[PDB]
Scaffold this active site. Structure first.
Site, PDB file in Angstrom:
ATOM      1  N   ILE A  50     -21.998 -29.914 -18.327  1.00 50.85           N
ATOM      2  CA  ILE A  50     -20.666 -30.489 -18.346  1.00 50.85           C
ATOM      3  C   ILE A  50     -19.657 -29.461 -17.830  1.00 50.85           C
ATOM      4  O   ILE A  50     -18.775 -29.807 -17.055  1.00 50.85           O
ATOM      5  CB  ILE A  50     -20.273 -30.989 -19.756  1.00 50.85           C
ATOM      6  CG1 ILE A  50     -21.035 -32.281 -20.064  1.00 50.85           C
ATOM      7  CG2 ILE A  50     -18.767 -31.246 -19.841  1.00 50.85           C
ATOM      8  CD1 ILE A  50     -20.960 -32.725 -21.517  1.00 50.85           C
ATOM      9  N   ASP A  80     -21.250 -13.898 -26.359  1.00 46.51           N
ATOM     10  CA  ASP A  80     -21.871 -14.634 -27.449  1.00 46.51           C
ATOM     11  C   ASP A  80     -20.781 -14.848 -28.490  1.00 46.51           C
ATOM     12  O   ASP A  80     -20.291 -13.888 -29.087  1.00 46.51           O
ATOM     13  CB  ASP A  80     -23.027 -13.817 -28.027  1.00 46.51           C
ATOM     14  CG  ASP A  80     -23.783 -14.545 -29.118  1.00 46.51           C
ATOM     15  OD1 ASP A  80     -23.297 -15.554 -29.668  1.00 46.51           O
ATOM     16  OD2 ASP A  80     -24.888 -14.086 -29.429  1.00 46.51           O
ATOM     17  N   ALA A 104     -27.075 -25.991 -32.339  1.00 45.82           N
ATOM     18  CA  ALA A 104     -27.672 -26.102 -33.655  1.00 45.82           C
ATOM     19  C   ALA A 104     -29.177 -25.957 -33.475  1.00 45.82           C
ATOM     20  O   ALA A 104     -29.709 -26.355 -32.444  1.00 45.82           O
ATOM     21  CB  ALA A 104     -27.339 -27.443 -34.272  1.00 45.82           C
ATOM     22  N   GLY A 149     -19.764 -21.928 -21.113  1.00 41.89           N
ATOM     23  CA  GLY A 149     -20.847 -22.907 -21.259  1.00 41.89           C
ATOM     24  C   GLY A 149     -21.508 -23.449 -19.999  1.00 41.89           C
ATOM     25  O   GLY A 149     -22.298 -24.394 -20.076  1.00 41.89           O
ATOM     26  N   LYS A 176     -19.004 -31.161 -35.011  1.00 42.35           N
ATOM     27  CA  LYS A 176     -18.036 -31.756 -34.081  1.00 42.35           C
ATOM     28  C   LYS A 176     -16.787 -32.259 -34.800  1.00 42.35           C
ATOM     29  O   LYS A 176     -15.687 -32.185 -34.255  1.00 42.35           O
ATOM     30  CB  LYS A 176     -18.667 -32.891 -33.261  1.00 42.35           C
ATOM     31  CG  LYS A 176     -19.698 -32.451 -32.231  1.00 42.35           C
ATOM     32  CD  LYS A 176     -19.135 -31.437 -31.247  1.00 42.35           C
ATOM     33  CE  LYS A 176     -20.106 -31.204 -30.093  1.00 42.35           C
ATOM     34  NZ  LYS A 176     -19.575 -30.206 -29.127  1.00 42.35           N
ATOM     35  N   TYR A 229     -28.430 -36.736 -34.328  1.00 40.70           N
ATOM     36  CA  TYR A 229     -27.377 -35.771 -34.041  1.00 40.70           C
ATOM     37  C   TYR A 229     -27.096 -34.954 -35.292  1.00 40.70           C
ATOM     38  O   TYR A 229     -26.833 -33.755 -35.215  1.00 40.70           O
ATOM     39  CB  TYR A 229     -26.123 -36.504 -33.583  1.00 40.70           C
ATOM     40  CG  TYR A 229     -25.165 -35.634 -32.832  1.00 40.70           C
ATOM     41  CD1 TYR A 229     -25.534 -35.043 -31.628  1.00 40.70           C
ATOM     42  CD2 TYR A 229     -23.887 -35.392 -33.319  1.00 40.70           C
ATOM     43  CE1 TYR A 229     -24.656 -34.232 -30.931  1.00 40.70           C
ATOM     44  CE2 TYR A 229     -23.002 -34.589 -32.627  1.00 40.70           C
ATOM     45  CZ  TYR A 229     -23.386 -34.015 -31.434  1.00 40.70           C
ATOM     46  OH  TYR A 229     -22.500 -33.227 -30.736  1.00 40.70           O
TER      47      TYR A 229
HETATM   48  N1  LIG Z   1     -24.328 -33.761 -22.643  1.00 37.79           N
HETATM   49  C1  LIG Z   1     -23.855 -34.599 -23.564  1.00 37.79           C
HETATM   50  O1  LIG Z   1     -24.427 -35.653 -23.803  1.00 37.79           O
HETATM   51  C2  LIG Z   1     -22.597 -34.253 -24.321  1.00 37.79           C
HETATM   52  C3  LIG Z   1     -21.762 -35.268 -24.762  1.00 37.79           C
HETATM   53  C4  LIG Z   1     -20.610 -34.929 -25.460  1.00 37.79           C
HETATM   54  C5  LIG Z   1     -20.315 -33.593 -25.686  1.00 37.79           C
HETATM   55  N2  LIG Z   1     -21.129 -32.625 -25.264  1.00 37.79           N
HETATM   56  C6  LIG Z   1     -20.735 -31.238 -25.545  1.00 37.79           C
HETATM   57  O2  LIG Z   1     -20.384 -30.551 -24.336  1.00 37.79           O
HETATM   58  C7  LIG Z   1     -20.602 -29.153 -24.492  1.00 37.79           C
HETATM   59  C8  LIG Z   1     -21.451 -28.656 -23.330  1.00 37.79           C
HETATM   60  O3  LIG Z   1     -22.804 -29.092 -23.470  1.00 37.79           O
HETATM   61  P1  LIG Z   1     -23.680 -29.619 -22.220  1.00 37.79           P
HETATM   62  O4  LIG Z   1     -24.010 -31.072 -22.466  1.00 37.79           O
HETATM   63  O5  LIG Z   1     -23.019 -29.244 -20.921  1.00 37.79           O
HETATM   64  O6  LIG Z   1     -25.033 -28.761 -22.444  1.00 37.79           O
HETATM   65  P2  LIG Z   1     -25.332 -27.324 -21.773  1.00 37.79           P
HETATM   66  O7  LIG Z   1     -26.609 -26.788 -22.378  1.00 37.79           O
HETATM   67  O8  LIG Z   1     -25.207 -27.434 -20.269  1.00 37.79           O
HETATM   68  O9  LIG Z   1     -24.104 -26.427 -22.330  1.00 37.79           O
HETATM   69  C9  LIG Z   1     -24.046 -25.952 -23.680  1.00 37.79           C
HETATM   70  C10 LIG Z   1     -23.587 -24.508 -23.581  1.00 37.79           C
HETATM   71  O10 LIG Z   1     -23.315 -23.911 -24.858  1.00 37.79           O
HETATM   72  C11 LIG Z   1     -23.661 -22.531 -24.704  1.00 37.79           C
HETATM   73  N3  LIG Z   1     -23.893 -21.741 -25.935  1.00 37.79           N
HETATM   74  C12 LIG Z   1     -24.791 -21.996 -26.908  1.00 37.79           C
HETATM   75  N4  LIG Z   1     -24.734 -21.031 -27.861  1.00 37.79           N
HETATM   76  C13 LIG Z   1     -23.804 -20.131 -27.490  1.00 37.79           C
HETATM   77  C14 LIG Z   1     -23.246 -18.870 -28.030  1.00 37.79           C
HETATM   78  N5  LIG Z   1     -23.698 -18.365 -29.204  1.00 37.79           N
HETATM   79  N6  LIG Z   1     -22.268 -18.242 -27.314  1.00 37.79           N
HETATM   80  C15 LIG Z   1     -21.810 -18.730 -26.142  1.00 37.79           C
HETATM   81  N7  LIG Z   1     -22.276 -19.876 -25.596  1.00 37.79           N
HETATM   82  C16 LIG Z   1     -23.255 -20.602 -26.209  1.00 37.79           C
HETATM   83  C17 LIG Z   1     -24.960 -22.574 -23.907  1.00 37.79           C
HETATM   84  O11 LIG Z   1     -25.288 -21.303 -23.330  1.00 37.79           O
HETATM   85  C18 LIG Z   1     -24.655 -23.655 -22.892  1.00 37.79           C
HETATM   86  O12 LIG Z   1     -24.156 -23.100 -21.667  1.00 37.79           O
HETATM   87  C19 LIG Z   1     -21.260 -28.995 -25.858  1.00 37.79           C
HETATM   88  O13 LIG Z   1     -20.253 -28.603 -26.782  1.00 37.79           O
HETATM   89  C20 LIG Z   1     -21.800 -30.375 -26.180  1.00 37.79           C
HETATM   90  O14 LIG Z   1     -21.921 -30.634 -27.577  1.00 37.79           O
HETATM   91  C21 LIG Z   1     -22.249 -32.928 -24.591  1.00 37.79           C
END
Ligand SMILES: NC(=O)c1ccc[n+]([C@@H]2O[C@H](COP(=O)([O-])OP(=O)(O)OC[C@H]3O[C@@H](n4cnc5c(N)ncnc54)[C@H](O)[C@@H]3O)[C@@H](O)[C@H]2O)c1
Ligand SMILES: NC(=O)c1ccc[n+]([C@@H]2O[C@H](COP(=O)([O-])OP(=O)(O)OC[C@H]3O[C@@H](n4cnc5c(N)ncnc54)[C@H](O)[C@@H]3O)[C@@H](O)[C@H]2O)c1
Ligand SMILES: NC(=O)c1ccc[n+]([C@@H]2O[C@H](COP(=O)([O-])OP(=O)(O)OC[C@H]3O[C@@H](n4cnc5c(N)ncnc54)[C@H](O)[C@@H]3O)[C@@H](O)[C@H]2O)c1
Ligand SMILES: NC(=O)c1ccc[n+]([C@@H]2O[C@H](COP(=O)([O-])OP(=O)(O)OC[C@H]3O[C@@H](n4cnc5c(N)ncnc54)[C@H](O)[C@@H]3O)[C@@H](O)[C@H]2O)c1
Lengths: 246, 257, 246, 257
Positions: free
Chosen positions: C19, C63, C94, C12, C163, C156
């Site tokens: 993150i 993927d 989503a 990710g 989640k 959300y």
């Molecule tokens: N940023 C926030 O506010 C927040 C808060 C709590 C939790 N999160 C969670 O943290 C995680 C990371 O998100 P983020 O905020 O760093 O955003 P981000 O866009 O930096 O990371 C999300 C990642 O999910 C990957 N992804 C999506 N579809 C995919 C697939 N089919 N196969 C493989 N990878 C895939 C994307 O390529 C991306 O790198 C997520 O699960 C998100 O729900 C985010």
């Protein structure tokens, strides 16, 4: 009415705004026969008046600070009733100065002790003293709690600790008495002055709850309809606690 | 270490089986400088010896029943330290008789009062007394709780109510002090064989049951609790406050195992 | 560094705001050796660049919609590494149209399916495929969740259901793998645009959390320092979730 | 009764052991007028017979895998009823093979998808399709969940993830529809011997364990679940939305019993 035949002792009814009054009214509408306690002799006439309107003349003094008084209530009640089917705990107190401003500045050992003793220990104390009258009757206990048990909230302060102790008390009482046919559950009610506006603006229902809504939930929890439920805290707050970032 | 130079006051260390000893050791391994309290004069020599082994000669008497003693600790500590970065609450008590058999039969007003005062009020009492030394430092408080806060458990009885009060205390303290840069978190530890634990009737059964039923299929150690505390006392956890972290090998999240 | 000797696979990471980047950086600062996945070939160069800066040249396409690709990652990684000590799930998706406005209007069967498959099923899918490399190593899995699992939150929407499924996945994975020395924990992170202002105004810390704060918590949960912790969701939100009526 | 004249659509009633039958009976005792769905044509006669005994001849086919069928139910129901006061979700499914043994070995993408679609998506799908008939009536939705949502439990496996999704669905639906006067709540029932329950490996052990370990020292009945549903469908519960109520004899709040 689904409380026909149920004899229910209700604590904490000091006015027609009281949550305990909402509960008393709800229970009476479902056919329950009621009895009441009052904390100090000053309130006796007021409570007797309210009791009479709910078709009851069973009214007893009880300061839950006193083991003697607690036990005396059931000794006296036992002269009128064969057993006790319902017990409503709707009692809380903490010194006013502990319920304002900064949590740590407002707190003291004595305020903590008083809050917990009156608001939390009173649940097991009453359950213990009621136990001979309640056991084997498929009876039920209901106690009132508040969101401060599980969330930090402004001003509620030491009362939050006391409510947490209470909710744990509910679980331990339920586990203790279930085998002998007494249930014990809690209601975490929404607020009932700008705080009211906040909840009404932020909860799923977009309004505050009423003593009737709390009262009907208590009536249900005191009835045989809820015979599968014990050790539960039911939220009657229009869904406030389950909403966030609203 | 990730606590290098952090000054940390630790309560409740009375033997090398103590959770507080595990915490002290973990913190010292990460570079923290330590100080200790002890409840009564009879334990002073033992605690000084243990403290010396953790490179400390800052040891103070503190019965948390006494507001005088609680506040005196910080007045005395202040002669040696200009501020305080960490505070560990690892203290609990209830009369033995209240920790055995039927919950209601075993409970009394006096036992309830004592349990809550020593085991729950002591958290805000210590936070309050430490506040002048801790504020403005990005400091942290850690307290020890147990599953009885949130589940009915045999024999634990009135202590469950006290731990629930404590956990709420942790939340309220966190909400109170966050603006001043003081965090407050809890650890709900799995059962561990300690002096206080032997106060609970049938404790050896709780211990055997947990090891047979938790995801890890074993009990946790004071080192595991200690390392979690060290983390919660450090800047690494600066995004975490008002949290109860379970160090019980996943016991609380398992059922019907 | 408390992750010396630990080999950690991180999903990710698509930018230095991710993150997963915060986690990668935090882990590398504690001595971990890292490897990375990327969802589509378009992102390969970007991720390799970031990986190189974190002293890694182990980068694999994955993927999580594809079982073949998931399994292929570990087949390839196994040629370089004897075992896997850490697995970071930082993946959610989503359709954008499901993440806006009225919950029921915005939802559809296909959006639900996609959200759950990518955001929730991906945890057990990855744990399952990693299991041969992770078992017996005293290894650890960390997944990112959000408050929508346990509270209704505006916008959300279906992601909240996903989640919740994820967090349950964390518990079931932890219970499943604990005996063979693999832990599984979650981090529920605070938000990282007016929503940010709300959290910062309402949480105990009076500010939003950083990817560094999330990253350091992940590093801890991936290390032996957290060896007593499994099936846990740790909130890194500055205490937001435990505050109310603020 | 406290549901006098309330019009309630009940899903999932396939036998007199069904939780949905317990709910139907409880609601009918309180004066509700009922309607029912059935998953496949093979069950129609059975469900019509059961419905007739509950004074209803409003019976409709609905496989919740199908958006066409879900929406068609309300189009057809609308010919008979001007609005809908109650909606009962009492439907779950996962392939048997996913509900036995090691969680990860037993799981597959396809089983996950099916479990979530039938057991979790079906709640918002039904709420959405019922919304025109329910809005502005002070109406209510009730759905059935299980402890696997919040605890790891042997054999329940992927269904636990699905129930967690469902419970979150209940919260989001409640938040969504509260302004329109539609409530949405859940009941987390203790184990009960039903057709679907026999899909779970070693179910008879879960049942025996709960009765030995819960505060009430017995399992709950469909009547107890049913009466709780009736309450949650009535105006008596008008202050309650987005709630999961445990009807498990206190099992979930007990530990180390
Ligand atoms: N940023 C926030 O506010 C927040 C808060 C709590 C939790 N999160 C969670 O943290 C995680 C990371 O998100 P983020 O905020 O760093 O955003 P981000 O866009 O930096 O990371 C999300 C990642 O999910 C990957 N992804 C999506 N579809 C995919 C697939 N089919 N196969 C493989 N990878 C895939 C994307 O390529 C991306 O790198 C997520 O699960 C998100 O729900 C985010
Ligand atoms: N009103 C709310 O916003 C709200 C919300 C949630 C929970 N509650 C809880 O509901 C319960 C009832 O409170 P209320 O809102 O109806 O207020 P209230 O003032 O009408 O009732 C509180 C009662 O507690 C009684 N009490 C205090 N000290 C006592 C003692 N030593 N012995 C015996 N009785 C004593 C008082 O006499 C009073 O009748 C309380 O436990 C309260 O914490 C209230
Ligand atoms: N051992 C366990 O199974 C376990 C599990 C979870 C939480 N806890 C908690 O961990 C904490 C430490 O307990 P432990 O297991 O290390 O046992 P322990 O006996 O090593 O420590 C208990 C400490 O509490 C102190 N204490 C008691 N009364 C006091 C007073 N009036 N003033 C000051 N100090 C006082 C004792 O002196 C002792 O140092 C307690 O809060 C306990 O409830 C223990
Ligand atoms: N019995 C228990 O121990 C227990 C405990 C807690 C919750 N629950 C839940 O209660 C609900 C009802 O289950 P039950 O125990 O009464 O079993 P049951 O077999 O009587 O009911 C299950 C129902 O789900 C229906 N269903 C399955 N797939 C469907 C589809 N594609 N479309 C429409 N309907 C479909 C079945 O036809 C059946 O009517 C389920 O959600 C179950 O998970 C059951």
């Amino acid at each position: 009415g689904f409380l026909q035949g149920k004899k229910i002792l209700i604590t904490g009814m000091i006015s027609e705004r009281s949550i305990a009054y909402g509960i008393a009214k709800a229970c009476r509408e479902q056919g329950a026969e009621l009895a009441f306690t009052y904390v100090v002799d000053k309130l006796e006439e007021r409570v007797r008046k309210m009791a009479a309107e709910l078709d009851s003349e069973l009214v007893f003094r009880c300061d839950v600070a006193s083991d003697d008084e607690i036990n005396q209530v059931f000794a006296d009640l036992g002269k009128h009733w064969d057993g006790l089917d319902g017990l409503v705990h709707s009692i809380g107190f903490a010194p006013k100065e502990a319920l304002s401003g900064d949590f740590l500045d407002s707190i003291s050992r004595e305020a903590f002790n008083t809050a917990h003793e009156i608001s939390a220990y009173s649940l097991p104390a009453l359950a213990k003293a009621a136990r001979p009258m309640m056991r084997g009757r498929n009876s039920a206990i209901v106690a009132l709690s508040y969101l401060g048990a599980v969330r930090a909230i402004p001003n509620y302060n030491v009362m939050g600790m006391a409510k947490a102790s209470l909710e744990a008390g509910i679980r331990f009482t339920a586990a203790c008495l279930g085998k002998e046919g007494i249930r014990c559950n809690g209601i975490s009610a929404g607020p009932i002055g700008k705080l009211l506006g906040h909840v009404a603006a932020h909860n799923p229902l977009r309004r505050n709850v009423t003593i009737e809504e709390v009262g009907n939930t208590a009536a249900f929890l005191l009835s045989d309809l809820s015979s599968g439920i014990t050790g539960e805290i039911t939220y009657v707050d229009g869904g406030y606690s389950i909403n966030a970032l609203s």
